[PDB]
Design a binder for this molecule. Structure first.
Ligand SMILES: CC(C)C[C@@H](NC(=N)N)C(=O)NCC(=O)N1CCC(c2cc(-c3ccc(OCc4ccc(C(=O)O)o4)c(Cl)c3Cl)nn2C)CC1
Length: 117
C-alpha cells in the first residue's frame, strides 16, 4: 500500500514536470502568464491535493489555449483522487499565481511527500 502511494505521487510529479518543461520551451510564454490560478495557503499533507483537483479544469483550459491536453489532465485527475474517503474544505491564499508558479509549487509539494517515508 505504501509503495503504490509512492509510485502514484512519482507519476503525478512527472506529469507536472512534463507540463513545466514544455512551457519553458516556448512572446508566447509571456501570454501564458496572464492565466491565473488559485493557490493553497500551505500544502503539507496529502489531504491538500483537493486544491490541485479543483484547479485541474483551469489547467486543462490554459493547455488548450497554447500542447492531447484532455488526455493528460484525465490521467492526473485519477492519480490525485486516488491519492486523497475524507472530505476536506481547501483553503486558498490571498494571492493568485501564474502557470509557472502553480506547477512549481505542486512539484515541490510532491517532492516533500516522497521524502517523508
Ligand atoms: C479570478 C481567477 C483567479 C479565476 C481563474 N480560475 C481559476 N484558476 N480557478 C480564471 O478563470 N482564470 C482564467 C484567466 O486567467 N484568463 C485570462 C487569460 C485568458 C486567455 C489566455 C489566452 C491565451 C491566448 C494566446 C496564447 O498563446 C498563443 C499565441 C501564439 C503566439 C502568441 C504570441 O506571439 O504572443 O500567442 C496563450 Cl498561451 C493563451 Cl493562455 N486566451 N485567453 C482568452 C483565459 C482566462
Amino acid at each position: 500500500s505504501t509503495k503504490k502511494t509512492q509510485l502514484q505521487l512519482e507519476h503525478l510529479l512527472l506529469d507536472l514536470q512534463m507540463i513545466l518543461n514544455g512551457i519553458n520551451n516556448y512572446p508566447k510564454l509571456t501570454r501564458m502568464l496572464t492565466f491565473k490560478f488559485y493557490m493553497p495557503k500551505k500544502a503539507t499533507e496529502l489531504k491538500h491535493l483537493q486544491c490541485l483537483e479543483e484547479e485541474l479544469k483551469p489547467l486543462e483550459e490554459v493547455l488548450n489555449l497554447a500542447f492531447r491536453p484532455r488526455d493528460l489532465i484525465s490521467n492526473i485527475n485519477v492519480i490525485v483522487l486516488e491519492l486523497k474517503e475524507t472530505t476536506f474544505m481547501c483553503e486558498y491564499a490571498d494571492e493568485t499565481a501564474t502557470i509557472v508558479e502553480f506547477l512549481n509549487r505542486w512539484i515541490t509539494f510532491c517532492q516533500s511527500i516522497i521524502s517523508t517515508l
